[PDB]
């Protein structure tokens, strides 16, 4: 028995028996945590729109 994060695939199923998924997963986007950027030179115009 293999209790591990083993992805269920068609090719694997043809060779072994996979149980029902105990945790679902997918592809996600990973980005850096947004920190406070340095203020722009002409940032005194920010309060009002262009």
């Amino acid at each position: 028995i293999a209790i591990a994060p083993l992805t269920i695939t068609l090719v694997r199923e043809e060779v072994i028996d996979f149980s029902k998924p105990f945790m679902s997963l997918g592809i996600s986007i990973m980005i850096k945590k947004p920190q406070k950027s340095k203020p722009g030179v002409f940032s005194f115009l920010d309060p009002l729109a262009y």
């Binding site: 028995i1 293999a2 591990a4 994060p5």
Partner: protein, 32 residues
């Protein structure tokens, strides 16, 4: 009949214990 469980070291699924040098058997592994 003892059952053999195969497993890859992946965190946090299965990680080596911080003090596995003082532990033996299945106590060496912890995780999901």
């Amino acid at each position: 009949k003892t059952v053999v469980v195969t497993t890859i070291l992946e965190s946090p699924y299965v990680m080596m214990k911080k003090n596995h040098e003082m532990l033996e058997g299945n106590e060496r592994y912890e995780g999901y």
